[PDB]
From Swiss-Prot, chain B:
The chain holds residues 486 to 534 of 1273 of the full protein. Residues 34-49 are annotated as: Disordered. Binds to host ACE2. RBD also interacts with the N-linked glycan on 'Asn-90' of ACE2. Cleavage of S generates a polybasic C-terminal sequence on S1 that binds to host Neuropilin-1 (NRP1) and Neuropilin-2 (NRP2) receptors. Interacts with host integrin alpha-5/beta-1 (ITGA5:ITGB1) and with ACE2 in complex with integrin alpha-5/beta-1 (ITGA5:ITGB1). May interact via cytoplasmic c-terminus with M protein. May interact (via N-terminus) with host bilirubin and biliverdin, thereby preventing antibody binding to the SARS-CoV-2 spike NTD via an allosteric mechanism. Changing residue 34 to P: Increased resistance to human covalescent sera neutralization. This is Spike protein S1. Changing residue 20 to H: In strain: Omicron/BA.1, Omicron/BA.2, Omicron/BA.2.12.1, Omicron/BA.2.75, Omicron/BA.4, Omicron/BA.5, Omicron/BQ.1.1, Omicron/XBB.1.5, Omicron/EG.5.1. Changing residue 8 to R: In strain: Omicron/BA.1, Omicron/BA.2, Omicron/BA.2.12.1. Changing residue 1 to V: In strain: Omicron/BA.4, Omicron/BA.5, Omicron/BQ.1.1. It comes from Severe acute respiratory syndrome coronavirus 2. Attaches the virion to the cell membrane by interacting with host receptor, initiating the infection. The major receptor is host ACE2. When S2/S2' has been cleaved, binding to the receptor triggers direct fusion at the cell membrane. When S2/S2' has not been cleaved, binding to the receptor results in internalization of the virus by endocytosis using host TFRC and GRM2 and leading to fusion of the virion membrane with the host endosomal membrane. Alternatively, may use NRP1/NRP2 and integrin as entry receptors.
């Protein structure tokens, strides 16, 4: 997300056993960085190998 | 007639005077936009009590 120009990121890493679409559980996501870029964003797209 | 190459070389020389010797000029521009502040001065500190 991007709030007042600051672009914030939160993430983690965990193992799973992907039996279904997603797991029924709980786990919090820690912060990673906070960039004071200062632009408008309205769209995005993924990059694959 | 009334047609000259606009760019002209300089006479920067040891023979030149104070008003004609070269001077490395640096104009330091600043910007205060709605975008966030990214450059700041150095902060101080002290020991821990």
């Amino acid at each position: 997300k991007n709030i007042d120009g600051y672009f914030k990121i939160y993430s983690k890493h965990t193992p799973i056993n992907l039996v279904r679409d997603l797991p029924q559980g709980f786990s919090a996501l820690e912060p990673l960085v906070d960039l004071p870029i200062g632009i408008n964003i309205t769209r995005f797209q993924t990059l694959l190998a | 007639f009334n047609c000259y190459f606009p760019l002209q070389s300089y006479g920067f020389q040891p023979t030149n005077g104070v008003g004609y010797q070269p001077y490395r000029v640096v104009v330091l521009s600043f910007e205060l936009l709605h975008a966030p502040a990214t450059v700041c001065g150095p902060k101080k500190s002290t020991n821990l009590v």
